[PDB]
Amino acid sequence: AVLNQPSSVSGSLGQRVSITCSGSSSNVGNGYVSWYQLIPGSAPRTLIYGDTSRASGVPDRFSGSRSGNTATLTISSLQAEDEADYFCASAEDSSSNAVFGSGTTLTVLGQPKSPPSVTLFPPSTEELNGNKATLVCLISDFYPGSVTVVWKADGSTITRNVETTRASKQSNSKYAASSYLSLTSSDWKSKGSYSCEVTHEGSTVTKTVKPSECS
Amino acid sequence: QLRESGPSLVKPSQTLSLTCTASGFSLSDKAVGWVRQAPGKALEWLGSIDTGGNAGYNPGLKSRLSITQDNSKSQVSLSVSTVTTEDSATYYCTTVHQRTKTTKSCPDGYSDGYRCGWRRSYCGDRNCCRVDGGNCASYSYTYTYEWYVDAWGQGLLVTVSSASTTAPKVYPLSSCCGSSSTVTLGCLVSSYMPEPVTVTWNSGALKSGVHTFPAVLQSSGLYSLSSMVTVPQTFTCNVAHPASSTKVDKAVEP
């Protein structure tokens, strides 16, 4: 038995949003609901306990309430830092038996779009001595969190041996991603130049390296 | 600050054992709990041990859980027996508030004596009596089970799997010959399994301008991550892969 939350909600900057937490009379109806905020990378943060009490350092923008078997977390004056996964919780039948909600991911709309910063690293001399060459394309500080990566060598698109990560949230609510071109030492020295082309919101940022001068 | 320590990889059907210590205060005065989150799942309660030595567990997992504690060394342990791939999760050590409140009350329209008339003598001491405005009623008892997590540890990622461990190869990253005012360096942590890997710079003395990226997963099952630093001097990245007991301090020179 787990508590029912919406999988995702969204609000605009400066506005307010509500997250519901529906259970039975055994858990939520018991009258002692807690709320927790999970931001990727950081440790989980206790927001609310005892339905309405705020934990230490929790601003009044976070307000908990409950009507019977349904608890609600209300977040006012939404900011980009509020984007996180929110979980409700309650004891059931015992103070040592806690049940968690399904979890709600909060998206704050209206944030300014940000182009990606791109850094393209050549393979190192040590890796080249092992007859391998990895080109590392690091993409950071873009919003919204979706980019398309295209690799090119001497004007031709590279599809084989390309691996690109998902976009992952940064601390500033911006996103990061990386793309790896795994070549051999000979493939690296064969071409005249390699390019990592990152497209974001119709705009493309391109960084290039040339094996003749990366030595 | 709560610190979880234990193995990053454990084989199926083995016993996963973790320990928790606090930095800054004593765990002797607090009730210590364990919470985990499997990837792509919600938070899941495991159990706790309170100041009185009593242990309570998630009923669904009670037969596989054991939470003990040592009060001389100020340490709390967690044991999960016969682990399976479902037990892969990030495990958090917590301090929890646990309390059961009992409330005694007469039912609606009943009192402990006032305005009961003849019913006060007829109902007796043990029961409530009907108020003007059945003849008797017994006391009702409402229980409020208070639970919440006071403090959270940072969490320890534990992967359960029968696959082998591959140590990473750490390579220095730097721009090519041919400039920019702020030099950008990096470190490539190539072809390792399983997660996680930690990266610091100059033994933790360098934090401004550091950007460590999440890992990529190749089809071979091996992971690779990179960490870059922007500096407007010696630079060394400290890579640690606990699953293979590997620790590499790679010097990076432009």
Residue numbers in the entry:
A (entry chain B): 2 to 9, 11 to 217
B (entry chain A): 29 to 161, 169 to 213, 216 to 269, 275 to 296
Paper excerpt:
Under these genetic constraints, cattle have developed a unique mechanism to accomplish antibody diversity by forming the broadest distribution of CDRH3 lengths and the most frequent occurrence of cysteine residues in CDRH3 loops. Consistent with the five structures solved previously, the 7 new CDRH3 structures also showed a long “stalk” formed by 2 anti-parallel β-strands supporting a compact, globular “knob”, further establishing the stalk-knob configuration as the general structural peculiarity for the ultralong bovine CDRH3s. Each of the knob structures starts with the conserved sequence motif [CP(D/E/A)G(Y/W)], in which the initial cysteine residue forms the first disulfide bond with another cysteine residue in the knob, and the motif forms a type I β turn. The compact globular folds of the knobs are maintained primarily by several disulfide bonds, a feature that is similar to the core of other small disulfide rich proteins or domains such as voltage-gated sodium channel antagonist mu-conopeptide, CnIIIC.
The four antibodies with 6 cysteines (BOV-1, BOV-2, BOV-3, BOV-4) used three different cysteine pairing patterns; BOV-1 and BOV-2 used, while BOV-3 used and BOV-4 used pairing patterns. In contrast, in the knobs of antibodies BOV-4 and BOV-3, a two-turn α-helix and a long loop extend from the first and the second of the three antiparallel segments. These four knobs could be described as two-layered structures with the three antiparallel segments as the first layer, and the additional structural elements packed against the first layer as the second layer.
